Design a protein around this ligand. Structure first.
Ligand SMILES: CCCCCCCCCCCCCCCCCCCCCCCCCC(=O)N[C@@H](CO[C@H]1O[C@H](CO)[C@H](O)[C@H](O)[C@H]1O)[C@H](O)[C@H](O)CCCCCCCCCCCCCC
Ligand SMILES: *[C@@H]1O[C@H](CO)[C@@H](O[C@@H]2O[C@H](CO)[C@@H](O)[C@H](O)[C@H]2NC(C)=O)[C@H](O)[C@H]1NC(C)=O
Ligand SMILES: *[C@@H]1O[C@H](CO)[C@@H](O[C@@H]2O[C@H](CO)[C@@H](O)[C@H](O)[C@@H]2O)[C@H](O)[C@H]1NC(C)=O
Ligand SMILES: *[C@@H]1O[C@H](CO)[C@@H](O)[C@H](O)[C@H]1NC(C)=O
Ligand SMILES: OC[C@H]1O[C@@H](O)[C@H](O)[C@@H](O)[C@@H]1O
Ligand SMILES: [Cl-]
Lengths: 99, 275, 117
């Protein structure tokens, strides 16, 4: 059929200041069908008790979701968003970068 | 002249096979999610204190009853259509129904149905109609559906009567949250090298509400037409986020600024100058 | 493979009849529903009639009463008997099938010309 692969965008709520408390966001969008697996990672290991929005969809009917958790950025810690979907050969990871 | 917030009711029904299925729903008033509807639950949950609008508890309860019966019946109809029409699982169906109120006591509505992520049919006036690029078999289904007077009258009056009265109750009950104004914050950053002698300037804007925003890179009052704004991304607290980038040659970056306009600043634009 | 071949088109006076046919290749189990569309020059392709293997039919309002769709499951072919033709019926009439396993789009024929003078 026509299946759409997910777009993954990773960002923080506030300007990252090492040692201060912040929210880590992963917005997953433009995919079809709806079954999807999204994880937030702290140094490659899965984070627990991470919350998400109710699954919704845009005018063109592709689905979108927001996953987010409270976190504290540091100099050496690496954060990412890990997603798996039918359209994907492997799970795709997008690292967080404060730019 | 007052702001316009359409109500759109969304439904995601998924059928993996003849036994496994789930149906979930939500409703939006403008940019805000007012309701949620989970397959595990028996009721439509209200997310805001004003989600019920000016509806009585007994009025809200008969709606809860319609949705209970609709969800069960939607599921059984899909399974019976698939068996009769010989459709192949898995199936994914989406509905997008709702209305918007206008000044003058007028109102327009919609009820669109999608199959595998593409429109196949909609409700127009009094009955079901297929879309232009709808598969052949959808015409056999429209025929059965349009024989069901009760459902056609019910959809007609939900859209032409119930939905507009409901949104107007939401517009006064939620008057205050709909007019709320939250000021954004902006900060600057450098991005990964686009070219050999080039720089990527990044302007971050976070925490504004409502959604309409204006963000552009400037040299004085000359807008830099190379500005690439991203998508407006959500925050967990229902404010928004934006990143606006500009690719420039190293030396021309000096003297550029990032200008942010928003209803919350009352003309006092946020203007950040490049390092 | 799926192969839909049309025949029975031609040129007929206003008021006349015409009968189109569509021969499909494959099992009686691999074709689920058969139908007809038409496209006039420089316009959209409009749905005309559909018929299932069980014999249920649906017609578009423009033609309800003048056209009848029919089916022979033994030879897996569908017919469209066109009566009381008007000049506005001039178009390419296309055959369509709903093939088992492909629910999102039709399989099409190459079309056959119908001119009404
Ligand atoms: C819609 C506006 C609502 C406005 C209210 C504002 C509140 C919003 C807050 C809550 C929002 C929560 C998210 C909402 C999710 C989507 C909402 C959509 C609105 C539901 C409309 C309900 C239709 C009412 C009629 C109904 O339930 N019919 C039932 C029961 O009818 C039976 O039983 C009846 C008595 O119980 C009668 O005896 C009847 O003759 C018999 O046939 C009937 O059986 C209907 O067919 C059920 C489905 C109807 C939708 C069809 C959609 C097209 C499906 C195409 C699929 C093709 C197959 C492809 C594989
Ligand atoms: C219908 O689909 C569901 C979900 O896709 C199937 O349930 C899965 O069954 C496998 C074992 O066969 C389990 O490992 C999964 O954990 C199950 N998932 C869920 C969500 O329960 C179910 O088996 C399918 N039914 C048929 C008859 O094939
Ligand atoms: C979504 O909700 C359905 C009911 O509203 C569930 O179907 C039911 O399943 C029970 C067993 O759990 C059956 O005994 C009953 O006949 C009914 O069909 C359905 O399983 C549920 N799906 C998920 C994924 O939770
Ligand atoms: C919708 O309501 C208006 C106002 O009562 C009425 O004039 C119109 O006929 C209705 N339309 C339908 C499709 O029921
Ligand atoms: O995780 C909570 C989420 O629930 C959603 O349904 C709402 O859009 C938000 O309040 C939030 O993003
Ligand atoms: Cl009940």
């Amino acid at each position: 059929m026509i299946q759409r692969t997910p777009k993954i965008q990773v960002y923080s709520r506030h300007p990252a200041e090492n040692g201060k408390s912040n929210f880590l966001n992963c917005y997953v969008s433009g995919f079809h069908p709806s079954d999807i697996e999204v994880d937030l990672l702290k140094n490659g290991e899965r984070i627990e008790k991470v919350e998400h929005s109710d699954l919704s969809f845009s005018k063109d009917w592709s689905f979108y979701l927001l996953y987010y958790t409270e976190f504290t950025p540091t100099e050496k810690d690496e954060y990412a968003c890990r997603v798996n979907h039918v359209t994907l050969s492997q799970p795709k990871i997008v690292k967080w970068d404060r730019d | 002249m007052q702001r316009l917030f359409p109500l759109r009711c969304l439904q995601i029904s998924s059928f993996a096979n003849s036994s496994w299925t789930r149906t979930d729903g939500l409703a939006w008033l403008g940019e805000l999610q007012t309701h949620s509807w989970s397959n595990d639950s028996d009721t439509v949950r209200s997310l805001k204190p004003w989600s019920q609008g000016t509806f009585s508890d007994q009025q809200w309860e008969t709606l809860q009853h319609i949705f209970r019966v609709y969800r069960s019946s939607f599921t059984r109809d899909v399974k019976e259509f698939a068996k009769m029409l010989r459709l192949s699982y898995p199936l994914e169906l989406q509905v997008s129904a709702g209305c918007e109120v206008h000044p003058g006591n007028a109102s327009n509505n919609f009820f669109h149905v999608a199959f595998q992520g593409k429109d196949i049919l909609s409700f127009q006036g009094t009955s079901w109609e297929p879309t232009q690029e709808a598969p052949l078999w959808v015409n056999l289904a429209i025929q059965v559906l349009n024989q069901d007077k009760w459902t056609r009258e019910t959809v007609q009056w939900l859209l032409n009567g119930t939905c507009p009265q409901f949104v107007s109750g939401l517009l006064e009950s939620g008057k205050s949250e709909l007019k709320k104004q939250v000021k954004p914050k902006a900060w600057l950053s450098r991005g990964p090298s686009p070219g050999p002698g080039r720089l990527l300037l990044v302007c971050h804007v976070s925490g504004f509400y409502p959604k309409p925003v204006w963000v552009k890179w400037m040299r004085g009052e000359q807008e830099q037409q190379g500005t690439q704004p991203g998508d407006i991304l959500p925050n967990a607290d229902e404010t928004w986020y934006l990143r606006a980038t500009l690719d420039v040659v190293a030396g021309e970056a000096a003297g550029l600024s990032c200008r942010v306009k928003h209803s919350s600043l009352e003309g006092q634009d946020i203007v950040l100058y490049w390092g | 493979q799926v192969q839909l071949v049309e025949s029975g088109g031609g040129l007929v006076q206003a008021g006349g009849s015409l009968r189109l046919s569509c021969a499909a290749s494959g099992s009686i189990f691999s074709i689920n529903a058969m139908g007809w569309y038409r496209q006039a020059p420089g316009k959209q392709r409009d749905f005309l009639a559909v018929i299932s293997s069980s014999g249920s039919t649906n017609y578009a309002d423009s033609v309800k009463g003048r056209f009848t769709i029919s089916r022979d499951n033994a030879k897996n072919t569908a017919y469209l008997q066109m009566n009381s033709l008007k000049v506005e019926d001039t178009a390419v009439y296309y055959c369509a099938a709903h093939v088992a396993g492909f629910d999102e789009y039709n399989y099409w024929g190459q079309g056959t010309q119908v001119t009404v003078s």
